[PDB]
Amino acid sequence: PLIVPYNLPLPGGVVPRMLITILGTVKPNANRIALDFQRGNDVAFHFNPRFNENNRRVIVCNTKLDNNWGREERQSVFPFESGKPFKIQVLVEPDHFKVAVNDAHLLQYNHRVKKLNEISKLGISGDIDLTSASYTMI
Numbered sequence: 001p002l003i004v005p006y007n008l009p010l011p012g013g014v015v016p017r018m019l020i021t022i023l024g025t026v027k028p029n030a031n032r033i034a035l036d037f038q039r040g041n042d043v044a045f046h047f048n049p050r051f052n053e054n055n056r057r058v059i060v061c062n063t064k065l066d067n068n069w070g071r072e073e074r075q076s077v078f079p080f081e082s083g084k085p086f087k088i089q090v091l092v093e094p095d096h097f098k099v100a101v102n103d104a105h106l107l108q109y110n111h112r113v114k115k116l117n118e119i120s121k122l123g124i125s126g127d128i129d130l131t132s133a134s135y136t137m138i
């Protein structure tokens, strides 16, 4: 198992047609997962499944610039289940990050940080056992 939090360098940043695949298992009684695509200290794309926000499960997405969070984008479709193995695929497209979970499209997140070649880290954090984190070009 990989250490969590996990730092996956993305050399030279991201580019359209780059596919990032995260395989893991959600812990029992999970509270949160986070993927953080970072441009230095900024978070270009934060993808944050919350298992218990006011007793509801929701995905919160946002960007952090100069240490300030922006407007949240929320997805109530929630494909993660405590205790179960998952696959997150993040496909970089020209205008957005496209996220599929367990081979089913979940959401798109329009690029707010525009210097894709500077988004050169993926952090993976939260209540998972992490099996693999990798990328490839499609």
Ligand SMILES: Cc1ccc(S[C@@H]2O[C@H](CO)[C@H](O)[C@H](n3cc(-c4c(F)c(F)c(N)c(F)c4F)nn3)[C@H]2O)cc1
Pocket: 032, 033, 034, 046, 048, 060, 061, 062, 069, 070, 072, 125, 126, 127
């Ligand atoms: C005024 C105001 C009031 C409340 C908020 S809440 C804020 O909302 C953001 C999305 O808009 C992010 O979710 C933030 N956030 C979550 C994590 C985090 C973490 F630190 C971890 F260690 C793990 N393991 C994890 F899964 C995480 F998600 N870090 N920063 C959250 O603090 C904002 C503004």
